[PDB]
Every structure is written in structure tokens, then in C-alpha cells.
Design a protein around this ligand. Structure first.
Ligand SMILES: CC(=O)NC[C@H]1CC[N@H+](Cc2cc(Oc3ccc(N4CC[NH+](CCC(=O)[O-])CC4)nc3)nc(-c3cc(Cl)cc(Cl)c3)c2)CC1
Ligand SMILES: *[C@@H]1O[C@H](CO)[C@@H](O)[C@H](O)[C@H]1NC(C)=O
Ligand SMILES: [Ca+2]
Ligand SMILES: [Ca+2]
Ligand SMILES: [Ca+2]
Ligand SMILES: [Cl-]
Ligand code: NA
Ligand code: NA
Ligand code: NA
Ligand code: NA
Length: 471
């Protein structure tokens, strides 16, 4: 195998490293996987389809302009170099290799397109038309953004966008399911807590956070239980950044944020789908859980779950490992159909006050076709009132003892609107048996005399009852 000759490939340290601080992509390329036959779309502010490092891989069938209602996602050029972000992300996935220009994509033989959706008013219809673009042609969608990362917003897909997620995972990709890759957010300096973003908090999105070059949690990272894994991105000014294609037929060495991590994950997922085109949207999440690597990622919250895997709210299961992903994909056995076990927990509404603990022992639908002995995602769908939402911290403990933070205190969230059936999601109990005692903790983290009531707690378990591996 011959590594790329592109002039900036040596600067793509997260691919080209010799010292084990990388995504192990060369190992996948050397197994023969480069993304050939896979189609990825960047949901962002447009794509410069004529960029010298994108044109050779550009796919009009992966592209649309939902802001101006036309097929051509070319960016709107301005003095301030607005509308460059989609082009940067596209190159991360699929910049052409061995052509003397910039660097390379993770999946440098994949086809790449973009949806111009963020350069205008983003409505539910705009989102649904983007997530639902050409779902039997596009395999993987990469989205780096969502509701405002101000540390005070709780929002997620409205009805059309949610319907687009379920149509995508159910009928998309010939019934195997569209793969939606999401960035978990850039709200770290606002103390944002990413389960409050319903896009990354969705089970249907494969959510990705960031690590800096020296293996630390970047300033912009949001912690939450819904994240599944990590890719490298930017950090402090002594740490390198992401090197990729830029608007106006240029390169950049200064692409940054969690919004630069999701495209790298989308590229790795593209290599993995080349290795086994029959993988379902759930299979892909299983592969990420099993192959991601905590080693050398620094966080104070690494915890071992009930099946012996280390998990963090900053990093999920750790750094994606492309060589391991493609290797495990090749002989992967499709997971069993997805079951869903619904447990309405409360017998009466519960005053929250300073602290509330709710304990319930469940059988996880014993005796039913939705009996789950092998969990995937779990949700605590909560309906509660509270006088100052951001003073709440919420945790969920599984029968195996795994303590998932569903919500951390958000100092800027002054809302008095509470949570209206908000489906807080955790990936940290993946592969555990969910039968037994679950514990929900709601705490007022402030010294103020705050008040409210929990009126509904639905525990929703997804998973199967077959196929488990030794812890
Ligand atoms: C009841 C109802 O009907 N409720 C409609 C709401 C539902 C919630 N939704 C949240 C949402 C806002 C948003 O708003 C934006 C707008 C602009 C940006 N930008 C533009 C500038 N960029 C500069 C970067 C740089 O230059 O480096 C940064 C990002 N981000 C988020 N997007 C998304 C979103 C993003 C992607 Cl990707 C894919 C999908 Cl599906 C949805 C979602 C808004 C409509
Ligand atoms: C894909 O997986 C399904 C489910 O296991 C199986 O029925 C089908 O034969 C597989 N198709 C290919 C082409 O491997
Ligand atoms: Ca256009
Ligand atoms: Ca190149
Ligand atoms: Ca956020
Ligand atoms: Cl469902
Ligand atoms: Na965000
Ligand atoms: Na997700
Ligand atoms: Na444990
Ligand atoms: Na149990």
C-alpha cells in the first residue's frame, strides 16, 4: 500500500500520524477500503462542487439546495467568507487523493455531495427535505449543527423532521436505514449539556464528540449520555487543527470544533460500509460501540459499564478506530429486529423540591415479543415542571450500576417551561440486561428554594434478546 502524496497529507495528523494519536485510517486503506461505491452528503451551507479537490468525487445525486429550491448547492460567496463550512466538511470525508492538491478525505474514493440548507431560514420542512434527500442513493448524511448552542435551549426535530428520521432508518438505503452522523455540539463554554439537542439525542443519529491533539476535552465540547464516540478536532493554539478543502478553491489548516469531528466519523463509516454494504443503521452503531478506543483520552468521568466497556460523557466509547471498524464489519452478523419495551413508571406525580429519587424494578417486557435482554439505547422520557430549568441535574442508574447523566446543570437556562415528554437518551448501558432496578435522580444543584413536579416518567428500552458477547 502507498500512502497519499498530496502536499498537505503530512499535516493531516489525525490520519497520517506515526505515534498512535490518530484514527487508524491508514490501516483501513491498506486493507483495501477507500469508500468506493459509497455516497455521503453534507447537510450544511453548501458545497463548492468545482473545488479542485472535490470535483472528481462530486455527486449531483447527493446534493440539493433547499434554501433556494433548486438542485445546485453551490455556496453564496461573500466578502466575509460565509458559507464555507460545507466545503470544509466535504473535503474531510472525500477530498481526492494523489492529485497534488490539499490533502485527502478519510474516504477518498467515496462520492460526496451537499445540501445547501443553512443559508436561509431553517424550518421543519427544510430539515425534513434535507434529511430525506434521495434516501436510496445517499448512504450516509453528515450534520454538524442543530439548535443554538447557547446553554439555554431545549429543542429537537419537529414533526416533519422526526418523520424523516423514521422514514430514513426504516425504508432508506433499501431498508437497511440511512446513517445519520451528528456532531454533539459546540456549546462547552456556555456549559451546554447535549441531551438538550434532540438531533444528537436521537437514537437515529450516530453522535460524535471531539478530542484535542494532546488527548483532552476541548473547550467547546458538550458532555452528554447520548454521545457514542469521538474523533480528533481542534484545541488550544499549540495543538493542530483539521486540514481540508476551503471555499474559493483553497485549502485550510484551521477547521475546528465538534462540527469538524462529525465529517471525519462519516468518512470512517463510509469505509466501514464499503467493507460490508449490508450493515443496517443499528449494526453501524454496534460496530462503533465495540471498536472505539478510550486509550489516551483524558477525562475525569471514565466509568466501566455492566459489560466491561469504559464510557465517558465527553467521549462516548472513545476514539473511532477505522482499521478495527472495517475489520469487524466484514463478517458481522446482522442484529436481530429492534424491540421496544415501554414502562410507565410513576403511580402518582412526585414533588421535586431539592431532590427526588424514583426507584422501579422492571422485567423489561418479560414474556412479550418486546422482551429485551440486550439493551441498545435507553430513554427516560420525562414530563416535569420546575421554576428554573438549568438548576436541575438528572441521573439514571441501570440495574448493572451504570450511572448515566441525563442532564447536567446549565447555569444559563432560566426557563420556567420544564420538560414536556423530553426523551433523554443514554448509550452507556449498551449490551447490558435492563431487567432489575432502575433509579432516576433529579436534584436541585442551586441553593435557591426551587420547586416543581415530575408528572410522567416513561422508561423506554430498545434492544434485542439474542446474540450477546462475553463481557
Ligand atoms: C415547531 C417547529 O416547526 N419548529 C421548527 C424548528 C425545529 C428545531 N430546529 C433546530 C435547528 C436549527 C438550525 O439552525 C441553524 C442555522 C444555521 C446554522 N449555522 C449557519 C452558520 N454556520 C457558520 C459556521 C462557520 O461559518 O464556520 C454555523 C451553523 N446552524 C444551525 N439547524 C438545524 C439543523 C441543522 C442541520 Cl446541519 C441539519 C438539520 Cl436536519 C437541522 C436545526 C429549527 C426549526
Ligand atoms: C443482508 O442481511 C440480511 C439479514 O441478515 C440477509 O437476509 C441478506 O441475505 C443479506 N444480504 C446480503 C447481500 O448479504
Ligand atoms: Ca442553488
Ligand atoms: Ca487532494
Ligand atoms: Ca448543544
Ligand atoms: Cl420508536
Ligand atoms: Na450544535
Ligand atoms: Na444520536
Ligand atoms: Na460499573
Ligand atoms: Na437484572
Amino acid at each position: 500500500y502507498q500512502e497519499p502524496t498530496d502536499p498537505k497529507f503530512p499535516q493531516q495528523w489525525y490520519l497520517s500520524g506515526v505515534t498512535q494519536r490518530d484514527l487508524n485510517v491508514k490501516a483501513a486503506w491498506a486493507q483495501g477500503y477507500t469508500g468506493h461505491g459509497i455516497v455521503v452528503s453534507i447537510l450544511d451551507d453548501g458545497i463548492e462542487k468545482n473545488h479542485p479537490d472535490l470535483a472528481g468525487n462530486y455527486d449531483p445525486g447527493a446534493s440539493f439546495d433547499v434554501n433556494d429550491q433548486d438542485p445546485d448547492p453551490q455556496p453564496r460567496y461573500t466578502q466575509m467568507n460565509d458559507n464555507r463550512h460545507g466545503t470544509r466538511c466535504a473535503g474531510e470525508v472525500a477530498a481526492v487523493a494523489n492529485n497534488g492538491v490539499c490533502g485527502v478525505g478519510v474516504a477518498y474514493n467515496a462520492r460526496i455531495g451537499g445540501v445547501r440548507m443553512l443559508d436561509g431560514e431553517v424550518t421543519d420542512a427544510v430539515e425534513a427535505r434535507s434529511l430525506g434527500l434521495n434516501p436510496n442513493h445517499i448512504h450516509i448524511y453528515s450534520a454538524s449543527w442543530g439548535p443554538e448552542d447557547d446553554g439555554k435551549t431545549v429543542d429537537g426535530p419537529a414533526r416533519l423532521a422526526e418523520e424523516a428520521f423514521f422514514r430514513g432508518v426504516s425504508q432508506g438505503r433499501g431498508g437497511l436505514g440511512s446513517i445519520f452522523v451528528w456532531a454533539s455540539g459546540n456549546g462547552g463554554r456556555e456549559h451546554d449539556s447535549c441531551n438538550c439537542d434532540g438531533y444528537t439525542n436521537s437514537i437515529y443519529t450516530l453522535s460524535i464528540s471531539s478530542a484535542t491533539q494532546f488527548g483532552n476535552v476541548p473547550w467547546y465540547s458538550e458532555a452528554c449520555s447520548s454521545t457514542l464516540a469521538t474523533t480528533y478536532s481542534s484545541g488550544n493554539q499549540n495543538e493542530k487543527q483539521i486540514v481540508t478543502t476551503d471555499l474559493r478553491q483553497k485549502c485550510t489548516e484551521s477547521h475546528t470544533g465538534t462540527s469538524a469531528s462529525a465529517p471525519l466519523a462519516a468518512g470512517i463509516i463510509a469505509l466501514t460500509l464499503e467493507a460490508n454494504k449490508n450493515l443496517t443503521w443499528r449494526d453501524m452503531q454496534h460496530l462503533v460501540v465495540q471498536t472505539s478506543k478510550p486509550a489516551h483520552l483524558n477525562a475525569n468521568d471514565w466509568a466501566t459499564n455492566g459489560v466491561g466497556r469504559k464510557v465517558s460523557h465527553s467521549y462516548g466509547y472513545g476514539l473511532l478506530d477505522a482499521g478495527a471498524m472495517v475489520a469487524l464489519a466484514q463478517n458481522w452478523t446482522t442484529v436481530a429486529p429492534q424491540r421496544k419495551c415501554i414502562i410507565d413508571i410513576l403511580t402518582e406525580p412526585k414533588d421535586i423540591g431539592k431532590r427526588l429519587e424514583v426507584r422501579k424494578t422492571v422485567t423489561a417486557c418479560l414474556g412479550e415479543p418486546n422482551h429485551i435482554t440486550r439493551l441498545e439505547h435507553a430513554q427516560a422520557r420525562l414530563t416535569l415542571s420546575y421554576n428554573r430549568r438549568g438548576d436541575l441535574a438528572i441521573h439514571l442508574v441501570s440495574p448493572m450500576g451504570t450511572r448515566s447523566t441525563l442532564l447536567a446543570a446549565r447555569p444559563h437556562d432560566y426557563s420556567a417551561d420544564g420538560f414536556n415528554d423530553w426523551a433523554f437518551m443514554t448509550t452507556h448501558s449498551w449490551d447490558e440486561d435492563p431487567s432489575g432496578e432502575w433509579v432516576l435522580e433529579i436534584e436541585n444543584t442551586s441553593e435557591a428554594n426551587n420547586y416543581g413536579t415530575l408528572t410522567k416518567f416513561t422508561l423506554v428500552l430498545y434492544g434485542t434478546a439474542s446474540g450477546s458477547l462475553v463481557p
